[PDB]
Amino acid sequence: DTRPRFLWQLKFECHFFNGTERVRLLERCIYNQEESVRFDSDVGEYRAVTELGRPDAEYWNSQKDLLEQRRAAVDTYCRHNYGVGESFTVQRRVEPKVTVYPSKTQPLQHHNLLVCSVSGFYPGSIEVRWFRNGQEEKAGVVSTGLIQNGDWTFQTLVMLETVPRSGEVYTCQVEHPSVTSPLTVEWRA
Amino acid sequence: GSDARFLRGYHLYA
Amino acid sequence: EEHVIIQAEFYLNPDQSGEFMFDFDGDEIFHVDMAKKETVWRLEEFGRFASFEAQGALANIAVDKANLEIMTKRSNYTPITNVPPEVTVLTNSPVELREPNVLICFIDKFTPPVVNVTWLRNGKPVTTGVSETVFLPREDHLFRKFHYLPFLPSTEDVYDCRVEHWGLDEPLLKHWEFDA
């Protein structure tokens, strides 16, 4: 199949600041990969993003029957949906499973990457810290960053560059809104 | 009324 | 902000593929099975707290379809430019031999939203337990998609996620096998 494709996307974006104190509704019309016309509630009316969308902007703005529905949508649409889905979306909190292990199985006193795996958590915001004998190491930390699994869970790998000597105690500390006190997992060399 | 509300797109000009 | 809820719809010609979904901070809340006219909650537990009339989405698609025709003509038939996907294969959690895990095939930054994915265990197609998400929206108006394969990790098997998209020259294979 080599036929040309033509794509039309319509997007209604509800942006929420400080709970629902501030809400911004954004309707977007996109042909192929180009946004052509949009309604921004901060603007109050349609605006052509490209020349292709001009006949729709000046046309839709001509009907105050349409503009009133959209302007009011910040309440009847955005705030309503926030209210309905708040308990299972906004307030969703799944605790991370934390494990610590060296990447390479090898004799001691050789360079190794100590990985602190943090998986299955929600929401995304999190902080992972490495400690060596009770002292925080800030250098030599390599992270995969935040990874979205697509099933309402995140995972991340925070690795510490080290040459583990015998007797050393390495501790990974995770802070996350799903727990009131930091999760700590230790690895003893 | 625990329904997720939705908006419908307007018809383009012509 | 703190949060974003997105109602994202698309219609694609000549495929006649339509989609209707809600997105929350990058995750799918639900979509509508167009053929069967039912609401599909990404996590089934969601449908225990909220409802959506799937029938309403079909009129949206009808409007989307009509508007596409008009817009194709307006641009005098500028076809979409294919953007090939970045493919990544990873696992749900750290791999432990002989302990159930899940292979995630992440397909990102592509358009149009048509892709073909097949899992390969030692070069053979696997369908058992496979699941996939619908096409998820991006700010740059490209798409993302996830494919899943539950599997039992072992030193004996290798895996490939095979993705074919019009932007690619040949089918892409991202390789996974246990390493240690």
Q: How far apart are CA C109 and CA C102, in angstroms?
A: 23
Q: Which of C70, C73, C75 to mutate to test the interface with B (most CBs of B within 10 A)?
A: C70
The coordinates were experimentally obtained by: X-ray
Selected from 2.60.40.10, 3.40.50.720, 3.10.20.30, 3.40.190.10, the CATH number assigned to the domain covering C80-179 reads: 2.60.40.10
Looking at residue C112, its amino acid is P
E-strand spans in A103-168?
112-121, 127-132, 135-137, 141-143, 147-148, 154-162
Q: Which chains would you list as touching C if contact means 3+ CB atom pairs under 8 Å?
A: A, B
**What Cα–Cα distance (Å) separates residue B11 from each residue in A55, A68, C77?**
12, 16, 19
Residue to mutate among C11, C20, C27, with most A CBs inside 10 A, is C27
| Residue A30's CATH number | 3.10.320.10
Domain co-membership, A74 together with A120: no
CA dist A18 and A82 (Å) reads 12
Any known ligand binding at A92?
yes
Domain spans of chain C, in order of start: 1-79, 80-179
Tokens matching residue A41? 């509630």
Residues A40 and A25 grouped into a single domain: yes
Residues of chain B numbered 1-14 and touching chain C (CB < 8 Å): 2-4, 6-14
What DSSP element (H or E) covers A83?
Answer: helix A80-85
Helix (H, G, I), strand (E, B) or coil at A144: coil
| Amino acid letter, residue A151 | D
The amino acid occupying position C48 is R
What's the token pair of residue C163? 């993705």
Report yes or no: A155 and A97 within 8 Å, Cβ to Cβ. Answer: no
The continuous run of DSSP H or E covering A172 comes out as strand A169-175
Distance from CA of B13 to the nearest CA of A (A): 5
* Spatial contact of C48 and C91, defined as CB atoms under 8 Å apart: no
Structural domain range at position A162: 92-189
- A80 is known to lie in a ligand binding site: yes
The CA–CA distances, whole Å, from A185 to A99, A100, A118, A123, A166 equal 7, 7, 11, 20, 18
* C-alpha span between C145 and C133 (Å, rounded): 6
Contact C159, C105 (CB under 8 A): no
CB contact under 8 A, C63 and B11: yes
Angle at C130 between CA C127 and CA C135, to 5 degrees: 120
Q: Please report which helix (H) or strand (E) contains residue C159, including its range.
A: strand C158-164
Task: Quickly list DSSP for C45-99.
Answer: GGGGT-B--HHHHHHHHHHHHHHHHHHHHHTTS-PPPPBPPEEEEEESS---TTS
- Give dist(CA A147, CA A96) in Å, integer: 13
Backbone angles phi and psi of A173, in degrees to 5? -115, 120
Residues A34 and A114 grouped into a single domain: no
| Residue C18 contacts residue C65 (beta carbons within 8 Å) | yes
CA distance A137 to A124: 23
C172: nearest Cα among C108, C84, C81: C84
Handedness of CA C93, C97, C98, C102 (dihedral sign): positive
CA nearest C25: which of A85, A38, A138, A180?
Answer: A85
Helix (H, G, I), strand (E, B) or coil at A64: helix
Nearest to A90 by CA among C83, C1, C85, C94: C1
Resolution (A): 2.2
> What percent helix, strand, coil does chain B show, rounded to 5?
0, 5, 95
Of how many residues is chain C composed?
Answer: 180
Whether residue A126 sits in one domain with residue A67: no
Among A6, A9, A12, A41, the residue to mutate for chain B (most B Cβ within 10 A)? A12
Q: Which of B2, B4, B12 lies nearest to residue C70, judging by beta carbons?
A: B12
Q: Does residue A34 sit in the same domain as residue A82?
A: yes
CATH number at residue A158: 2.60.40.10
Tell me: is residue A111 an annotated ligand-binding position: no
Out of B5, B10, B14, the one facing A80 most closely (by C-beta) is: B5
**What DSSP character marks residue C124?**
E
Architecture of domain C1-79: Roll (3.10)
What is the distance in angstroms between the CA of the first residue and the CA of the last residue of chain C?
Answer: 42
